[PDB]
Each structure stands twice: as C-alpha cells, then as structure tokens.
Design a binder for this molecule. Sequence first.
Ligand SMILES: [Mg+2]
Ligand SMILES: [Mg+2]
Ligand SMILES: [Mg+2]
Ligand SMILES: [Mg+2]
Ligand SMILES: [Mg+2]
Ligand SMILES: [Mg+2]
Ligand SMILES: [Mg+2]
Ligand SMILES: [Mg+2]
Ligand SMILES: [Mg+2]
Ligand SMILES: [Mg+2]
Ligand SMILES: [Mg+2]
Ligand SMILES: [Mg+2]
Ligand SMILES: [Mg+2]
Ligand SMILES: [Mg+2]
Ligand SMILES: [Mg+2]
Ligand SMILES: [Mg+2]
Ligand SMILES: [Mg+2]
Ligand SMILES: [Mg+2]
Ligand SMILES: [Mg+2]
Ligand SMILES: [Mg+2]
Ligand SMILES: [Mg+2]
Ligand SMILES: [Mg+2]
Ligand SMILES: [Mg+2]
Ligand SMILES: [Mg+2]
Ligand SMILES: [Mg+2]
Ligand SMILES: [Mg+2]
Ligand SMILES: [Mg+2]
Ligand SMILES: [Mg+2]
Ligand SMILES: [Mg+2]
Ligand SMILES: [Mg+2]
Ligand SMILES: [Mg+2]
Ligand SMILES: [Mg+2]
Ligand SMILES: [Mg+2]
Ligand SMILES: [Mg+2]
Ligand SMILES: [Mg+2]
Ligand SMILES: [Mg+2]
Ligand SMILES: [Mg+2]
Ligand SMILES: [Mg+2]
Ligand SMILES: [Mg+2]
Ligand SMILES: [Mg+2]
Ligand SMILES: [Mg+2]
Ligand SMILES: [Mg+2]
Ligand SMILES: [Mg+2]
Ligand SMILES: [Mg+2]
Ligand SMILES: [Mg+2]
Ligand SMILES: [Mg+2]
Ligand SMILES: [Mg+2]
Ligand SMILES: [Mg+2]
Ligand SMILES: [Mg+2]
Ligand SMILES: [Mg+2]
Ligand SMILES: [Mg+2]
Ligand SMILES: [Mg+2]
Ligand SMILES: [Mg+2]
Ligand SMILES: [Mg+2]
Ligand SMILES: [Mg+2]
Ligand SMILES: [Mg+2]
Ligand SMILES: [Mg+2]
Ligand SMILES: [Mg+2]
Ligand SMILES: [Mg+2]
Ligand SMILES: [Mg+2]
Ligand SMILES: [Mg+2]
Ligand SMILES: [Mg+2]
Ligand SMILES: [Mg+2]
Ligand SMILES: [Mg+2]
Ligand SMILES: [Mg+2]
Ligand SMILES: [Mg+2]
Ligand SMILES: [Mg+2]
Ligand SMILES: [Mg+2]
Ligand SMILES: [Mg+2]
Ligand SMILES: [Mg+2]
Ligand SMILES: [Mg+2]
Ligand SMILES: [Mg+2]
Ligand SMILES: [Mg+2]
Ligand SMILES: [Mg+2]
Ligand SMILES: [Mg+2]
Ligand SMILES: [Mg+2]
Ligand SMILES: [Mg+2]
Ligand SMILES: [Mg+2]
Ligand SMILES: [Mg+2]
Ligand SMILES: [Mg+2]
Ligand SMILES: [Mg+2]
Ligand SMILES: [Mg+2]
Ligand SMILES: [Mg+2]
Ligand SMILES: [Mg+2]
Ligand SMILES: [Mg+2]
Ligand SMILES: [Mg+2]
Ligand SMILES: [Mg+2]
Ligand SMILES: [Mg+2]
Ligand SMILES: [Mg+2]
Ligand SMILES: [Mg+2]
Ligand SMILES: [Mg+2]
Ligand SMILES: [Mg+2]
Ligand SMILES: [Mg+2]
Ligand SMILES: [Mg+2]
Ligand SMILES: [Mg+2]
Ligand SMILES: [Mg+2]
Ligand SMILES: [Mg+2]
Ligand SMILES: [Mg+2]
Ligand SMILES: [Mg+2]
Ligand SMILES: [Mg+2]
Ligand SMILES: [Mg+2]
Ligand SMILES: [Mg+2]
Ligand SMILES: [Mg+2]
Ligand SMILES: [Mg+2]
Ligand SMILES: [Mg+2]
Ligand SMILES: [Mg+2]
Ligand SMILES: [Mg+2]
Ligand SMILES: [Mg+2]
Ligand SMILES: [Mg+2]
Ligand SMILES: [Mg+2]
Ligand SMILES: [Mg+2]
Ligand SMILES: [Mg+2]
Ligand SMILES: [Mg+2]
Ligand SMILES: [Mg+2]
Ligand SMILES: [Mg+2]
Lengths: 274, 44
Amino acid sequence: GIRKYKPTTPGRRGSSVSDFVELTRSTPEKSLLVAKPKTGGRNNTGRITTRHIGGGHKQAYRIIDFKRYDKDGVPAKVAHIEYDPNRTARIALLHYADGEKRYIIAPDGVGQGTVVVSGPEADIKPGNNLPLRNIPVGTTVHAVELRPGGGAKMGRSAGASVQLVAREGKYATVRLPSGEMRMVDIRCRATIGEVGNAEQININWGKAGRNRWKGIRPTVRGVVMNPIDHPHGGGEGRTSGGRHPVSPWGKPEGRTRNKKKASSRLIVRRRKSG
Amino acid sequence: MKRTFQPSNRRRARNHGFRSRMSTRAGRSILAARRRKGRVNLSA
RNA sequence: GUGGGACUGGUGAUUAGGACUAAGUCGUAACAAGGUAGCCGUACCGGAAGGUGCGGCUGGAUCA
RNA sequence: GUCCGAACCCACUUCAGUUGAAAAUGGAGGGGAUGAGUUGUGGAUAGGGGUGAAAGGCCAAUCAAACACCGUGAUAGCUGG
RNA sequence: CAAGGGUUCCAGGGUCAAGUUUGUCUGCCCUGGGUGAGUCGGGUCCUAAGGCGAGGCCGACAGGCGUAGUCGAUGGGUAACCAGUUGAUAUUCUGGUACCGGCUUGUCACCGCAAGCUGCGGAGGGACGCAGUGAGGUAGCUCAUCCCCGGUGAUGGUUGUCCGGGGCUAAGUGUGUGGACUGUCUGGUAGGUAAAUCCGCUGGGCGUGAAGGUUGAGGCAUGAUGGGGAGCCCAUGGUUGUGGGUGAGUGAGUGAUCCUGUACUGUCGAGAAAAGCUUCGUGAGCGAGGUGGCGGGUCCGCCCGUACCCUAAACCGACACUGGUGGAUAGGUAGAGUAUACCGAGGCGAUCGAGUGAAUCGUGGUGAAGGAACUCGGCAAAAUGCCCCCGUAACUUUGGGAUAAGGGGGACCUGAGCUGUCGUGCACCCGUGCGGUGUGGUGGCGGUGAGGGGCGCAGAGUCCAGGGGGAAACGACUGUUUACCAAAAACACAGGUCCGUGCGAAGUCGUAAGACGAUGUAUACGGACUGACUCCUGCCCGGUGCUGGAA
RNA sequence: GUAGCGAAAUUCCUUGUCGGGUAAGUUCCGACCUGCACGAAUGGAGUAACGAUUUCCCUACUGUCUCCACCAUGAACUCGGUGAAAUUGCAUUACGAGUAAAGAUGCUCGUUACGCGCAGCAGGACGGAAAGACCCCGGGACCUUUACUAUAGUUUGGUAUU
Ligand SMILES: [Mg+2]
Ligand SMILES: [Mg+2]
Ligand SMILES: [Mg+2]
Ligand SMILES: [Mg+2]
Ligand SMILES: [Mg+2]
Ligand SMILES: [Mg+2]
Ligand SMILES: [Mg+2]
Ligand SMILES: [Mg+2]
Ligand SMILES: [Mg+2]
Ligand SMILES: [Mg+2]
Ligand SMILES: [Mg+2]
Ligand SMILES: [Mg+2]
Ligand SMILES: [Mg+2]
Ligand SMILES: [Mg+2]
Ligand SMILES: [Mg+2]
Ligand SMILES: [Mg+2]
Ligand SMILES: [Mg+2]
Ligand SMILES: [Mg+2]
Ligand SMILES: [Mg+2]
Ligand SMILES: [Mg+2]
Ligand SMILES: [Mg+2]
Ligand SMILES: [Mg+2]
Ligand SMILES: [Mg+2]
Ligand SMILES: [Mg+2]
Ligand SMILES: [Mg+2]
Ligand SMILES: [Mg+2]
Ligand SMILES: [Mg+2]
Ligand SMILES: [Mg+2]
Ligand SMILES: [Mg+2]
Ligand SMILES: [Mg+2]
Ligand SMILES: [Mg+2]
Ligand SMILES: [Mg+2]
Ligand SMILES: [Mg+2]
Ligand SMILES: [Mg+2]
Ligand SMILES: [Mg+2]
Ligand SMILES: [Mg+2]
Ligand SMILES: [Mg+2]
Ligand SMILES: [Mg+2]
Ligand SMILES: [Mg+2]
Ligand SMILES: [Mg+2]
Ligand SMILES: [Mg+2]
Ligand SMILES: [Mg+2]
Ligand SMILES: [Mg+2]
Ligand SMILES: [Mg+2]
Ligand SMILES: [Mg+2]
Ligand SMILES: [Mg+2]
Ligand SMILES: [Mg+2]
Ligand SMILES: [Mg+2]
Ligand SMILES: [Mg+2]
Ligand SMILES: [Mg+2]
Ligand SMILES: [Mg+2]
Ligand SMILES: [Mg+2]
Ligand SMILES: [Mg+2]
Ligand SMILES: [Mg+2]
Ligand SMILES: [Mg+2]
Ligand SMILES: [Mg+2]
Ligand SMILES: [Mg+2]
Ligand SMILES: [Mg+2]
Ligand SMILES: [Mg+2]
Ligand SMILES: [Mg+2]
Ligand SMILES: [Mg+2]
Ligand SMILES: [Mg+2]
Ligand SMILES: [Mg+2]
Ligand SMILES: [Mg+2]
Ligand SMILES: [Mg+2]
Ligand SMILES: [Mg+2]
Ligand SMILES: [Mg+2]
Ligand SMILES: [Mg+2]
Ligand SMILES: [Mg+2]
Ligand SMILES: [Mg+2]
Ligand SMILES: [Mg+2]
Ligand SMILES: [Mg+2]
Ligand SMILES: [Mg+2]
Ligand SMILES: [Mg+2]
Ligand SMILES: [Mg+2]
Ligand SMILES: [Mg+2]
Ligand SMILES: [Mg+2]
Ligand SMILES: [Mg+2]
Ligand SMILES: [Mg+2]
Ligand SMILES: [Mg+2]
Ligand SMILES: [Mg+2]
Ligand SMILES: [Mg+2]
Ligand SMILES: [Mg+2]
Ligand SMILES: [Mg+2]
Ligand SMILES: [Mg+2]
Ligand SMILES: [Mg+2]
Ligand SMILES: [Mg+2]
Ligand SMILES: [Mg+2]
Ligand SMILES: [Mg+2]
Ligand SMILES: [Mg+2]
Ligand SMILES: [Mg+2]
Ligand SMILES: [Mg+2]
Ligand SMILES: [Mg+2]
Ligand SMILES: [Mg+2]
Ligand SMILES: [Mg+2]
Ligand SMILES: [Mg+2]
Ligand SMILES: [Mg+2]
Ligand SMILES: [Mg+2]
Ligand SMILES: [Mg+2]
Ligand SMILES: [Mg+2]
Ligand SMILES: [Mg+2]
Ligand SMILES: [Mg+2]
Ligand SMILES: [Mg+2]
Ligand SMILES: [Mg+2]
Ligand SMILES: [Mg+2]
Ligand SMILES: [Mg+2]
Ligand SMILES: [Mg+2]
Ligand SMILES: [Mg+2]
Ligand SMILES: [Mg+2]
Ligand SMILES: [Mg+2]
Ligand SMILES: [Mg+2]
Ligand SMILES: [Mg+2]
Ligand SMILES: [Mg+2]
Ligand SMILES: [Mg+2]
Ligand SMILES: [Mg+2]
C-alpha cells in the first residue's frame, strides 16, 4: 500500500511512500546479484544520448528469470518477497525443489510459501508459467513472450496485465496494458496473474531530492533556452515556442512508428487519444 | 586562487606521454615533426 | 507605569440585499392542461422572470 | 532537501583595494551547513562539437563557435607610412 | 604525511649577483658529504571506472566497435614493535623482544581402480547503505594530606602538607571477564558448464530449555632482574660530556572523535568487483611408491621510494606574492562548543628603519541635547544578543507562524538534603582454588542545591552573542545561475496535462556495426508545455500544424 | 473575452478619482472602472509557510543628520637606505578682453609678475589610460524566417538483388 507523510517539513508535505507490507526479507539473495554501474545516459561514444539521467542511489542488479521454461515440471516454493531497486515491481525469490534459487516478478496475490510451477501441464494458478496454447481464453497473464523462447517482454511493470482474448489458429490475441490488440505465437510463454505492487503509481515523491536520488536530473524546458540550443528558444520575455511544438532536434510532433515492420501482427493500435 | 595548472605526473604521462603519442597516427606524426625540428623533448 | 490579549459602541470610501413609493421600462414565470402539469432537494446555464438534467411528491391530469 | 551555529562550501551588502598583497582579493557583517551537501584521486564527453537546475553560461586568466599550425605575404573602394 | 617540487637537507668556505634596506646572514654561490626495510608506502597479488584489445564484425581509404583476454587505485589483500644513536638517516641502522614466506634439516604421527603436487573450476567466504541511541571499556585529562625528587624564598609572612617537578614502558605470547556466535545424528536429491564426500533444496531420530563448545572489548600475567626517568659526586668544561649517583611507579575523579561495533535499533532511496582464504571434487598434466601433516633447529627473503619543504619563503599563483592546496594528531581554564579569550606541547618577533601631536585618506574609539530632521533608500552604524523559567497574536495546508511579542532569574560568600561513583570494613550466595553475586560501609572525589548573606554604577559584569512588529507585489518551498558589473520576479522543482513508443521500442550518438534508452517493457520510456496547494481552467477547427481518410 | 481580476511588474492620458496614513504622501494600502493595450496550463484568481528578492509603515536604536569635536593608529610629513610607474613635439609654459578650425600659456591689445624650492587642493592644459561601444558608411560574424539556392535526414515509386 501507500503511506502518506505528515507535513512536518516542506518537501515532505504532500509526499508519500509505500509501506512495504509485502516485503518478507530486507536483504537480497547474494548469489543472484551483479554490479550495475551507472551510465549517466552516455553512449559507448561517451556522449549523452538519453538526457536527464545521472546520480542517484547505488543499485545492484537482481538476476530475474524471464524464461522459466528451463525448469519445466520442477515445483518451486516462493521463499521470499523482496524489493528490487531496478523495477517498479517486487521480486519473488523462488526455491526450486532441486536446490536452484531464482527470481521472478512477483505476481499480485502470491506470498511466502506458495508453490509455483511451469509447463504445459501446469495448473492455472497465479505465478505458474504455461504456454499460451495451454492458458485458457479470457485469462489475465503477465510476462509474455513476443517470440517463443525469447523470454518475458510484455506486462512486467507494477500492476501490468495482459488479457488473453483468443487463440485462433497458430496465433493468440492479447490485449496489452496499453490497450493495443496484438497477435503472438501460441508457443509463447506467459505467467498466470497480474504484477503486484499495483498501487505504486499513487506515490507522491513531493521532493526534488527524491527524484534526484532516483536518478533523474533536472529537466530544462526548451522554451526558456536560446535559439541555438532549442528550436523553441529565443524571444524577448516569456514566449511560446514561436512555432509548433518540436523536439530539441527539430522533429515535429507526430507518429513515429515504422509503418513497415511487424505491423501484420498488430490487430488495433493502442488508441490513447482522448 | 585555484589556477589553471594543477600538476599530476600520472595524468601528464597518460596525456602527453610517449606511448600516448605512439598510440595514434596523429601523435606519431607529431613525434616525427618534433624529430625533424630537432626537439630534445619529443614528448612529456 | 509598561506590554500583549479579550469583549464591545460609534463611524467608514466602497458594496450587498430587504421594505415602501410613479399611475416608469423589459418580458409573462405562476393561477385553467396558464398554454412545456406544478412543486421539493441538488447541479449547471441564462438580462430578468426562469430553462434544463437527476431523483422524489400529488398539494396534477389524460385514459380506465 | 527541519532550526541555531564553527569547520567546510558559497558570494548578499558595505568599505578598502583598484600602476592592488591579489589579472577578481582583503576587513566587517551575510546564505547553506544530513544534503538536489561538500571534497580527494583516477577516468569519460572536443570545436558547428561537447556540456549546460539555461546566464549564450563554461570548455586552461578575454568563447554568438577554443587553441595551435597550415592555405597565407587571405582580403580590405578603408586608415596609416 | 599525500600531491607537487628536486638537493633547497648537513658541514665548511664566500659576499659580485639574487634578498624590495643593511648583511659578517640565507631556502643564494662554491666544495665535500648525507637518504640503509622480508614487515612502512608502491611493484612482484586482486579487481572498479575506464583504456587497450588475438581472432572478429563494421567502414571507399583513413578508421569505428568489440570477444577471448590484458592493463588500470582513488578500493580489497598482505608478517614489528619499543628504546637508543648521527652535523645530516631510521616501523630501515643498533639493542632488546617478535612475526611471515621459502629452502633445508631433526623427530613424531599418517596415506598407497586406488599417494600427492600443480592446474581447472563449484560452493562458502571476502562483501559492503544511511541515520540514531544506549551499554561495557580504554586512551587522554584533572586532583591528591599518597609515593618520589627538590625548595625554605631579594619585601611583611611562608617547616606544613607550604611551593615546584615527576608518579613510565610497546608489538608479540598466555589467560578468557564482559560481549558475541552456535541444536545434534543420519537419509535422500530434476540444481551448481566436468564432477563432487562440498553447497543448495528437502526427510527422519534425538534434543538443553542451554550446556557445552567456539570466539575474544578491556583487565591480569608475560615480554620487563630490561628500557626510560631528577639532583648528588675528587673530578670533567667551563654556554659542553663521561663513570658511579634513577628516587618513586599509588589512589580517586573525569572521560572520548577510539575499542567491543559491519554490535543494537530505526529506515527507504535498497547500498562495488575480483583475488588471497576455507572446502569440494577432477574437463589437465606431473609423479614415485613417495609425499603430505605436528612441535625443533640452520640459511634465503627481490625491485622502487626513504634527504628536505609541505594549512608553505621550497607546491599552484611571473615574486621570498595578506590568494589557493587533500589527510592525520590537536592539551589546560572559562565555555554547549573544534566559537571566543588567555595559556600548554612546540614554534615565532614577520624579511627597511628612526622620528614627528600638520592638512588629508584609511582603520578603530567616545559623545551633550535631539533621534532619520540624513539620504534615491535607515546605506553604514547603533540597539538586540546567552542560558533557565514564565508567557506568546492575526492567520493556518494544523506541521506551523515562534526565539512571535513581551517578562523574571543568573555571578560572589555560606549552605542545610538529595544524589553519581569508589572505598578499608559487617554478614552472606560462593559453583569458592569464582579474574564472581546480592545486602551492606562512618569516608574520599564529583554533580546539584532550598535558605541565609556580602559588595559594586553595573553579577549572560570581558571576548562572544537575534532587533522586533504591521502590510503589499512576485516566486509555493530547500535548491540553481551570468568564474571576472545582474542571485533575481530568472532556472530547477514536486504536482499536472498532452503527444510519441508493443520492444531490434520510440528517441539519441554514429557512415555503419554497434551503443545509450535498459540488463527497463505502457504504473515503463522519450518529447512538449505548466509549475506545491485551493477553487477553477470559458468560446473558436476559418488560418497554420498534427492525425485519419482516398472519390 | 466567460469565471475571475483591473491606474496592476500591464493604465499612455496620470500625481485619474475618492478613502486611509503624514503637520505636509507623484510612493504605499483599500476601493472605483473610463482595461491607451487583464484573462483562464505562454494558465486566471487566491494562498499558510519560506526569501541576503521588491515596496510602504510603526517601534526600538543610533554621529545618518542639526554639527561636528576629540583620541589612538597604517600611509602622508622629516632623516638614513633602497628605488619604480603611466606620460613625454618643444619650453624661460601669467591674467584680462579679444581674435582664429567658431572654447588660446604660445596670436592681438592691454594688465600683472624678482630667482628657486616644500607641503597641499583639483578649475584648466578640450589632462592620462582604451585607432568611440552611441551614430553613420564599408566588411564580418552569429541568429531568424512562408528570402534565394542547395543539402543531411525522412518519405514515394521504378529497377537490380529476384
Ligand atoms: Mg558465492
Ligand atoms: Mg572509444
Ligand atoms: Mg528528459
Ligand atoms: Mg532504475
Ligand atoms: Mg534566457
Ligand atoms: Mg534553430
Ligand atoms: Mg522560438
Ligand atoms: Mg512580450
Ligand atoms: Mg592550465
Ligand atoms: Mg457606508
Ligand atoms: Mg406563462
Ligand atoms: Mg406551465
Ligand atoms: Mg439551457
Ligand atoms: Mg537544513
Ligand atoms: Mg578547503
Ligand atoms: Mg555580486
Ligand atoms: Mg570602491
Ligand atoms: Mg535555513
Ligand atoms: Mg582524461
Ligand atoms: Mg539573451
Ligand atoms: Mg576562461
Ligand atoms: Mg564560424
Ligand atoms: Mg554551443
Ligand atoms: Mg591561395
Ligand atoms: Mg594588404
Ligand atoms: Mg585617420
Ligand atoms: Mg624524493
Ligand atoms: Mg649544494
Ligand atoms: Mg638550487
Ligand atoms: Mg641549509
Ligand atoms: Mg642588498
Ligand atoms: Mg654566510
Ligand atoms: Mg652556510
Ligand atoms: Mg598476473
Ligand atoms: Mg574492463
Ligand atoms: Mg587485429
Ligand atoms: Mg590477471
Ligand atoms: Mg595491476
Ligand atoms: Mg630530519
Ligand atoms: Mg624509531
Ligand atoms: Mg633490529
Ligand atoms: Mg567462487
Ligand atoms: Mg553485495
Ligand atoms: Mg621575608
Ligand atoms: Mg601532581
Ligand atoms: Mg548432483
Ligand atoms: Mg553435469
Ligand atoms: Mg561511555
Ligand atoms: Mg627515510
Ligand atoms: Mg624524513
Ligand atoms: Mg606545518
Ligand atoms: Mg604564501
Ligand atoms: Mg612561485
Ligand atoms: Mg569547560
Ligand atoms: Mg580560535
Ligand atoms: Mg612554549
Ligand atoms: Mg613552522
Ligand atoms: Mg620579503
Ligand atoms: Mg609629523
Ligand atoms: Mg561605536
Ligand atoms: Mg567618557
Ligand atoms: Mg549623541
Ligand atoms: Mg544621551
Ligand atoms: Mg527614541
Ligand atoms: Mg526625509
Ligand atoms: Mg533633505
Ligand atoms: Mg545595514
Ligand atoms: Mg553592531
Ligand atoms: Mg514558540
Ligand atoms: Mg523572546
Ligand atoms: Mg541560592
Ligand atoms: Mg542582568
Ligand atoms: Mg559564551
Ligand atoms: Mg492583490
Ligand atoms: Mg503596486
Ligand atoms: Mg523562490
Ligand atoms: Mg515554486
Ligand atoms: Mg534559497
Ligand atoms: Mg554549480
Ligand atoms: Mg559575477
Ligand atoms: Mg513531471
Ligand atoms: Mg531506434
Ligand atoms: Mg543495451
Ligand atoms: Mg513558468
Ligand atoms: Mg476545420
Ligand atoms: Mg484552430
Ligand atoms: Mg494530411
Ligand atoms: Mg495614483
Ligand atoms: Mg504613469
Ligand atoms: Mg490621496
Ligand atoms: Mg483555454
Ligand atoms: Mg494560453
Ligand atoms: Mg498574456
Ligand atoms: Mg504561474
Ligand atoms: Mg498567480
Ligand atoms: Mg502571498
Ligand atoms: Mg533572495
Ligand atoms: Mg518613526
Ligand atoms: Mg607612519
Ligand atoms: Mg627617503
Ligand atoms: Mg570668432
Ligand atoms: Mg581668454
Ligand atoms: Mg594672450
Ligand atoms: Mg611667442
Ligand atoms: Mg608644488
Ligand atoms: Mg603634495
Ligand atoms: Mg585641473
Ligand atoms: Mg582625454
Ligand atoms: Mg570603455
Ligand atoms: Mg575609430
Ligand atoms: Mg571595443
Ligand atoms: Mg553578411
Ligand atoms: Mg566572435
Ligand atoms: Mg525504395
Ligand atoms: Mg522496389
């Protein structure tokens, strides 16, 4: 859930924080961590390619199993539910019944002690992983593979959810959390249930410092720049862009998806609109 | 106040050292040009 | 004596509505099915009465 | 990203300096001072490029396009000789 | 100390130059000399960021990137301390006492498809945040009628506790007090690149309700019959050191930034890697029936640095420049304090002077009466200032506003009782031979003190140390910015909305490969504008742009 | 052009008008609307808290002032030592009224003035320092755009790969 902070100080006034009720362990599994040095948004050429990235608390990467099909038929106990700084979801530490320990995105509702499993003959329970041909139509899943064997790629963030709506032929139709209707191979795997920590979006950070140690550098809007720095720059006093809205590199606002690629597998566009 | 030159032998050797100059073809041509001029110090 | 409060009267540019008076101007909202039945709470809108939505009432009625 | 306040970081006011002690400081006060803090070492990004909590700021004491060399004895209806 | 400098260090000779003056002097000149490590700091070991990169992929050429690897400290790992000595060096030399790795040797014990060694990896371990409180200690400090070594005072007193000084010793080893850690015995086993008897995951039996075992803050013992430590000696040699003459080592108070301690508690923002190390096997070779273990002895232990300056006259600033420069140590009294005042350890008197009541400029000081009449403006200054106690408004997002405002007390003498701690001692549990425990002690030291009293103009008596209240505009806020005329109302900001993006994402760097985005997956990411919060955010799609459509 | 707001960081006229504050208020705070030329995310109107921000007021307080005086110091000043600097066509370099490239130490007519130093003050030498930035003219640079001409990129179809 969310715990609201009291307005003792400014910057703490309207802010809030998760209460971490679902965490059962305040430390990570040492054998599943790797170093994750920060990039600062810099390319292999050393230049900033993604802006507004830098600083923040040090983090260690947790190795998450997005495949789950190399342990088919081996039951696992959910040993722990714990915090992952690298994502908005929680991670379930699983003890497979052969000694192997692993991490998964924690599905909503699963807790310490429940038994997960993978395979075509796996039971339909949240946390179980099955092929889409075996997942029944109308099921809410997550961690969905685009291409069979490629690993989980869709529906992974906190509260994410994918709806399996049809299984015609060798394609399964899924509604993604964007609302877009997509066709994927029936052999693609998916995990039953939706992602937990669904209420994290309501967190009010209330403080520039909290994003600063979340790793977000300040954002300078282009309209207060100089004309050399941004197409919106220039002007005496406060102005608009002096033109239609554009990117810092002069690209006008508009659709940017490549119209010729895997569009033959997209049923309907996300339809954000308004 | 704090001035422009703040010495550091390791940084100097990594920047203008002989091996640094030999690493790239521009630096090798610089060494050749200094040899033609007759400098006693080909590099730092 | 000094200081900070409490309560309270007069007054106040400006401003608000109430009452009464031309036998003023603008519409006709209600009373008959008042010409869109009226009214209650609420919401928004409109020079003004009022208009409309939602739920309710008969202190309305048609047709039985 | 609480309060008062040293170190530390800053640079608001004032006076002095302004051929200075100093090519930006000193005296007196002043802001921050557990934080978006500060600092050491090493490293990365390079010139129509970098970086910029954005002032066209900064990039080796003069940056609306660094410095060095080269084209080069550039050109100048202009000034001087 | 580090960085940086590079002989400036020491001794002797010198006074052209240099030194903001002089100079017999010097960080200057000349000559000679000076830096000693198995343990200190680096290398021989390990990796981070990052660099390079066999093949390789990419690119007209030049080149870009990157695999296997290989480098790269600012981190990990790693065995020594005290004393003494020189004109110049010292965890380096010398003395004393240790430790680590080799080689070799003596002795005891043990192995044998089946020793071992070396490679190779598995696992364990190394291994990690921030904030805070408390407890047990020690360093240090203070005091002393106690112990030592002195003193008996130029001027009234000063032979009793009156005055001055001192009251010390390391690493290592042993011990095991606090504290901490820890059930035990077998079985199985989809995993750990090849394997595993070492790990992980699981099944049983037994199990105190802790008891042992393991560990190790300090203490004690040892190291240490040693080392260090004052004034008395025929004498020394007269700014000197020699041989004897070293005397003491107790107790209490106070108390850390250190130790237990990566402890404990809280907490979200969720806090390197690799090797050494322990153990496990064997995807490799070596290797003989020889090795590997436990106490004892001999020899071997490499390279670089080591002088000197270093909050500076030696470094960065052209200077022997009121500037800048990272880290460690940092005592006493007053004090909350690492502020400030005066002092200690120790170091300095500053690198032109001597005078002289000129105006004037700078820097401080005081001021009658008045008190902002000054002035663009209360600019500058003054006042206020500390602790304890009382008390405190509009408004408010209920947190604030607030140190609001506005008051009282403070130091000195004496001082009843109350307390912290220790104490010879009483009895007692004693597992005693425990390095203990609970009662319990006239007292010492320290803290605190109601009351009473003294003196002065003045008791936060010096230094130090908010003025306050009312109202409006702007920005919510803490922050950021024009290094060197603008710190702001500008930027950022949390929050908000819109647009893009289904992942080889969009976007961005690049010719490309690639890379960032992200080891992220629409509760995400990128772009745009707005800028906490409250109440709101109207009408217009004709123009332009965007989106869709295609007669 | 709605809510809201309005002589406002926006109001030219303008010190608008009225009201408060002062003995006196072009500023200030509250109103009016006649909005030269407010207005709703380039957000509208508010807002506790915050501010080395801007503005007005009260109090305290003072050398800010009436109106300055005095004290001590680092320079100044004298002596000894050491010893620069910018500047410089020249020199035995007065004033007055004139005159002149229209602002004279230097020319005219007059007036005054012994030679040389020391400490001072700043009216002039159109004083020194910087080949005026303002202006214009020539050149350049960067910036902008529905200026021109091109181009990376993005996109269309053909064709090769097929
Ligand atoms: Mg491990
Ligand atoms: Mg590169
Ligand atoms: Mg961004
Ligand atoms: Mg992240
Ligand atoms: Mg700007
Ligand atoms: Mg542009
Ligand atoms: Mg613009
Ligand atoms: Mg404008
Ligand atoms: Mg430099
Ligand atoms: Mg009235
Ligand atoms: Mg009617
Ligand atoms: Mg009607
Ligand atoms: Mg209507
Ligand atoms: Mg603070
Ligand atoms: Mg500093
Ligand atoms: Mg300034
Ligand atoms: Mg000045
Ligand atoms: Mg503050
Ligand atoms: Mg570099
Ligand atoms: Mg500008
Ligand atoms: Mg510069
Ligand atoms: Mg150019
Ligand atoms: Mg630029
Ligand atoms: Mg030519
Ligand atoms: Mg020419
Ligand atoms: Mg000329
Ligand atoms: Mg040296
Ligand atoms: Mg010499
Ligand atoms: Mg020398
Ligand atoms: Mg010397
Ligand atoms: Mg001399
Ligand atoms: Mg000499
Ligand atoms: Mg000498
Ligand atoms: Mg090696
Ligand atoms: Mg690397
Ligand atoms: Mg090659
Ligand atoms: Mg290696
Ligand atoms: Mg190395
Ligand atoms: Mg020495
Ligand atoms: Mg020594
Ligand atoms: Mg020795
Ligand atoms: Mg390992
Ligand atoms: Mg870790
Ligand atoms: Mg006497
Ligand atoms: Mg004593
Ligand atoms: Mg196995
Ligand atoms: Mg295997
Ligand atoms: Mg203690
Ligand atoms: Mg040495
Ligand atoms: Mg030394
Ligand atoms: Mg020193
Ligand atoms: Mg100096
Ligand atoms: Mg120097
Ligand atoms: Mg004290
Ligand atoms: Mg001090
Ligand atoms: Mg001394
Ligand atoms: Mg010294
Ligand atoms: Mg000097
Ligand atoms: Mg004099
Ligand atoms: Mg005074
Ligand atoms: Mg007096
Ligand atoms: Mg006076
Ligand atoms: Mg008086
Ligand atoms: Mg007064
Ligand atoms: Mg006045
Ligand atoms: Mg006046
Ligand atoms: Mg002032
Ligand atoms: Mg003052
Ligand atoms: Mg208060
Ligand atoms: Mg008060
Ligand atoms: Mg008393
Ligand atoms: Mg008093
Ligand atoms: Mg004090
Ligand atoms: Mg207002
Ligand atoms: Mg105003
Ligand atoms: Mg602000
Ligand atoms: Mg704000
Ligand atoms: Mg601020
Ligand atoms: Mg900065
Ligand atoms: Mg500045
Ligand atoms: Mg945002
Ligand atoms: Mg892309
Ligand atoms: Mg990537
Ligand atoms: Mg804005
Ligand atoms: Mg239209
Ligand atoms: Mg339109
Ligand atoms: Mg179109
Ligand atoms: Mg007016
Ligand atoms: Mg006006
Ligand atoms: Mg008036
Ligand atoms: Mg609108
Ligand atoms: Mg707008
Ligand atoms: Mg506007
Ligand atoms: Mg705004
Ligand atoms: Mg506003
Ligand atoms: Mg306000
Ligand atoms: Mg400010
Ligand atoms: Mg007054
Ligand atoms: Mg003097
Ligand atoms: Mg003289
Ligand atoms: Mg004339
Ligand atoms: Mg004349
Ligand atoms: Mg004349
Ligand atoms: Mg003449
Ligand atoms: Mg004179
Ligand atoms: Mg003079
Ligand atoms: Mg003059
Ligand atoms: Mg001039
Ligand atoms: Mg100028
Ligand atoms: Mg000119
Ligand atoms: Mg100029
Ligand atoms: Mg041009
Ligand atoms: Mg230029
Ligand atoms: Mg094509
Ligand atoms: Mg084609």
